[PDB]
UniProtKB/Swiss-Prot annotation:
Example GO molecular function: lysozyme activity
Protein family membership: Belongs to the glycosyl hydrolase 24 family.
InterPro entries, sorted: Endolysin_T4_type, Glyco_hydro_24, Lysozyme-like_dom_sf, Lysozyme_dom_sf, Phage_lysozyme-like, T4-type_lysozyme
UniProt keyword annotation of DNA-binding present: no
pH dependence: Optimum pH is 7.3.
Organism of this sequence: Enterobacteria phage T4 (Bacteriophage T4)
Protein name per Swiss-Prot or TrEMBL: Endolysin
GO biological process: cell wall macromolecule catabolic process; defense response to bacterium; peptidoglycan catabolic process; viral release from host cell by cytolysis
Any one Gene Ontology cellular component term annotated for this protein: host cell cytoplasm
Length: 164
């Protein structure tokens, strides 16, 4: 298993504009288009994103190309971020995939706000950190995905996804 397969499991794949769990306009593999309520603003962002008149629909290939960029951007974001970089550097390869997953979902800023959890991860206090991460709107809003990510941090294995 790898970060790509992992995220593809967590976000799914949709070829037509859709609303995400928060109610925002998304397409492909969890690619947020706009926080705006206008389908029209969404379609416009979409065309800009893809470079063609999509009319709200894209191909598998287009979805994947957006996905590749988003993963790259997630990694680069962590590498550039002063709160995140040190945690990332401290982690083994599987747990690193777990932090990338959070960042892809909630953004750099968002994850950087989990101060206490970040410190615990850094110190390798797995159980403690799993308990702290669960005390969040994140866990409350998307408990199934949050549990898979948390398990990955707790165990350092891909067990939670081997199921799926």
């Amino acid at each position: 298993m790898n970060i790509f397969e992992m995220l593809r499991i967590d976000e799914g794949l949709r070829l037509k504009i859709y609303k995400d769990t928060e109610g925002y306009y998304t397409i492909g593999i969890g690619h947020l288009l706009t926080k705006s309520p206008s389908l029209n603003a969404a379609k416009s962002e979409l065309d800009k994103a893809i470079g063609r008149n999509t009319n709200g629909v894209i191909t598998k290939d287009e979805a994947e190309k957006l996905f590749n960029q988003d993963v790259d951007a997630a990694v680069r974001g962590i590498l550039r971020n002063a709160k995140l970089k040190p945690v990332y550097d401290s982690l083994d390869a599987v747990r690193r995939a777990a932090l990338i997953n959070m960042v892809f979902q909630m953004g750099e800023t968002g994850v950087a706000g989990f101060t206490n959890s970040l410190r615990m991860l850094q110190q390798k206090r797995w159980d403690e950190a799993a308990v702290n991460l669960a005390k969040s709107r994140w866990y409350n809003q998307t408990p199934e995905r949050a549990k898979r990510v948390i398990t990955t941090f707790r165990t350092g294995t891909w067990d939670a996804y081997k199921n799926l």
